[PDB]
Amino acid sequence: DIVMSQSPSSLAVSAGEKVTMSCKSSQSLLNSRTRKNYLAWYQQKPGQSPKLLIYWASTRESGVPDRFTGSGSGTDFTLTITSVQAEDLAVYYCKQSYNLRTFGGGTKLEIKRADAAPTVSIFPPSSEQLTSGGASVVCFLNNFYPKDINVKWKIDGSERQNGVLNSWTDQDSKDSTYSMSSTLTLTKDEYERHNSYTCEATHKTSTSPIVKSFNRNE
């Protein structure tokens, strides 16, 4: 079976920059009789099916912008995107069709932008959830950049790590920011035994965390 290796796993660049990414096959993909390299590039945006950009190593699919260029031969192939736009945000896969088909592992393309601090909001358990015996405290951290961010939960000033579930959005297409949800789940009995709940966001846009809190005694 032919093995396909993409590099790098990920990269980030500002709009208007160029990127190149590499794909290497464990053996030659050059067909002797057509003289074509059976290597294709696909683009996959979040929530969508993969889309063919390039086939036969360098032929552009109908209606693909010219800023996407495939090149290379034998076992070494390259996709170059010239003048990167925000909407090129996607995972890029190479695929050989020389003997069966196999996909590379993908190269994730992230867009650079100006740093931005999260807007943080905290929400106590809903009365509906409390009737069912559970208690989830939620914290939203919206529209920040870069992606790296740390959230910490405290209950009456004491850090808590079990029961915390975090989820990040894909980089936003509209403004290139990220957002994240952090949810602390407790039993109702537990929740009812403490008064003060805090979510704290550490991000490189400030040395001081952004903290939101609520106090049941209030």
Partner: protein
Amino acid sequence: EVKLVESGGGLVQSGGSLRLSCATSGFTFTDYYMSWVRQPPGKALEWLGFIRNKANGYTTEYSPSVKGRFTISRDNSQSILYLQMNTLRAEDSATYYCARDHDRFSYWGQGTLVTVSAAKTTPPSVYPLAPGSAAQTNSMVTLGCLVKGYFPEPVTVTWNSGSLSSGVHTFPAVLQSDLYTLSSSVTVPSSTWPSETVTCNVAHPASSTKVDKKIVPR
């Protein structure tokens, strides 16, 4: 237009069996190879196999990972492609795509989700996230909906049936215990809520459940 529409995906137990379909139209079916490809959530594309065109006698090939276990076939009168999957395991959970192939004017279905698990179909609990009653305002307000304890994926969320989309962030679901939880936030001007209604619309097709949760103060 060329169209490929997958169906037959769903939840099945470990060791079970499932048959996927891909109904095609807008091209001469018999002239093309057809491939199946899959993608586990947040993972790379994996090619599974193809069935060749009439000129090649509709013969089949399979990747090593499913050879002997999955069977591709085609009904040439109705222009439908099938994938018969046997002895399923958790690792087979993925979005399965059909793709037109030949040996490129390129054309993939929207994909159908397969989940292999011992967990059972469960509708979500939908909890409104409104600011704590001792919370103080400013120009924008952030509300949310917590969608907890459902199975399998997917769930979809809208806000005021789509009219509030510009300030919305819906976070990817995460598995905990063996149920999914997600959340969605929406930001609107403080002057519009609670004077005007904000409702999160949650749909879970697997359990035939839609819920509208109005977000009320308190």
